Short mmCIF file of C-alpha atoms in Angstrom, two decimals:
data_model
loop_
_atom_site.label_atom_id
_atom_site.label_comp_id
_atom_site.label_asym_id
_atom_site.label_seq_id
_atom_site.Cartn_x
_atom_site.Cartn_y
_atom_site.Cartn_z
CA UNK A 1 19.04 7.85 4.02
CA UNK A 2 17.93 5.00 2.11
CA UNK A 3 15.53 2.88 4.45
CA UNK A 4 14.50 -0.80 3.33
CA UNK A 5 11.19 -0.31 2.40
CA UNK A 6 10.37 1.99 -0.24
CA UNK A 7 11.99 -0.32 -2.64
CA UNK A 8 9.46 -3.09 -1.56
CA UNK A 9 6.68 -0.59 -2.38
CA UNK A 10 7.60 0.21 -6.07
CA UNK A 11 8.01 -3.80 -6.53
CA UNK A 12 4.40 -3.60 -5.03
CA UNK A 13 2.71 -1.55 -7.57
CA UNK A 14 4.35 -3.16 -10.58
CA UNK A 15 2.86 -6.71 -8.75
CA UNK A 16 -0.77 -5.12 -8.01
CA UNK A 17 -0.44 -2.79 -11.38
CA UNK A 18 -3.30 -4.71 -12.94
CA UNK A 19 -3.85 -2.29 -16.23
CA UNK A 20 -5.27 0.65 -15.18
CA UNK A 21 -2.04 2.89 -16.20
CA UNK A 22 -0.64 2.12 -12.78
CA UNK A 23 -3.15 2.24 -10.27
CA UNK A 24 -4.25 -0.26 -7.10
CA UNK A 25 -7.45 -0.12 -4.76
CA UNK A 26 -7.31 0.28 -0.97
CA UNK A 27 -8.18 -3.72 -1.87
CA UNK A 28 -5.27 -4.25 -3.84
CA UNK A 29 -2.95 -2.66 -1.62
CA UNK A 30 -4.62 -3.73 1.76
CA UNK A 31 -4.18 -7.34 0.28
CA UNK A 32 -0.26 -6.11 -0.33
CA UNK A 33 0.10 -4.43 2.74
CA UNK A 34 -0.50 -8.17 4.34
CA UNK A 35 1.83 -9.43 1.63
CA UNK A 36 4.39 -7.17 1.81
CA UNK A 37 6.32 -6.17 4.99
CA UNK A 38 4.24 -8.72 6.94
CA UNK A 39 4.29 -8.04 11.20
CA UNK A 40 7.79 -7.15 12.63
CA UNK A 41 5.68 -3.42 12.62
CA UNK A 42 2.46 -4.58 14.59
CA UNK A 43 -0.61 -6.08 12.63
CA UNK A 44 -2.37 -2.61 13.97
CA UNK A 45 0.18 -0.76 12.39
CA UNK A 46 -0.84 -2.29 8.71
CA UNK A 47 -4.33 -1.75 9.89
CA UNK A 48 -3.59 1.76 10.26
CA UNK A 49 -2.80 2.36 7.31
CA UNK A 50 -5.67 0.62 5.92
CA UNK A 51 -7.85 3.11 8.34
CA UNK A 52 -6.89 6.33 7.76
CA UNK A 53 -8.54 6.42 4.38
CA UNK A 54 -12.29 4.99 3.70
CA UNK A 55 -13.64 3.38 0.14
CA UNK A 56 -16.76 4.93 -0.93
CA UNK A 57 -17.49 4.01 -4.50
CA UNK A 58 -14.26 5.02 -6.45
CA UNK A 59 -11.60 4.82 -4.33
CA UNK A 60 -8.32 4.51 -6.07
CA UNK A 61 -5.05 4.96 -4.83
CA UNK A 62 -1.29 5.53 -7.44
CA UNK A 63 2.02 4.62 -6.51
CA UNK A 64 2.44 8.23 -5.09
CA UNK A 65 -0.19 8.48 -2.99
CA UNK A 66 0.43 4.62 -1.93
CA UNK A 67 4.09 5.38 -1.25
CA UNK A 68 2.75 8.63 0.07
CA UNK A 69 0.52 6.62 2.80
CA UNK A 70 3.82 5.46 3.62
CA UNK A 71 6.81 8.30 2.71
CA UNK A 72 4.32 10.02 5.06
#
């Protein structure tokens, strides 16, 4: 049903939504992912997260695919 969680998420993007028509870098969101949640899930678990993808030049990540990462 409905988890506590997601709802944290959406609050995230509208934080790290600087002005790029809703859009965060692995930066932006690895620096929320610290924020938001915090440990009670394992400081490897945030990690994770942070690892399964790689930057490379352009990397940019929406709401979807950021809640994705996580509705996964």
């Amino acid at each position: 049903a409905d988890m506590i969680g997601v709802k944290e998420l959406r609050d995230a993007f509208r934080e790290f939504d600087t002005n790029g028509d809703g859009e965060i870098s692995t930066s932006e969101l690895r620096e929320a992912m610290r924020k938001l949640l915090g440990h009670q899930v394992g400081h490897r678990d945030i990690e994770e997260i942070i690892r399964d993808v790689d930057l490379n030049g352009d990397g940019r990540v929406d709401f979807e695919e950021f809640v994705r990462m996580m509705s996964r």
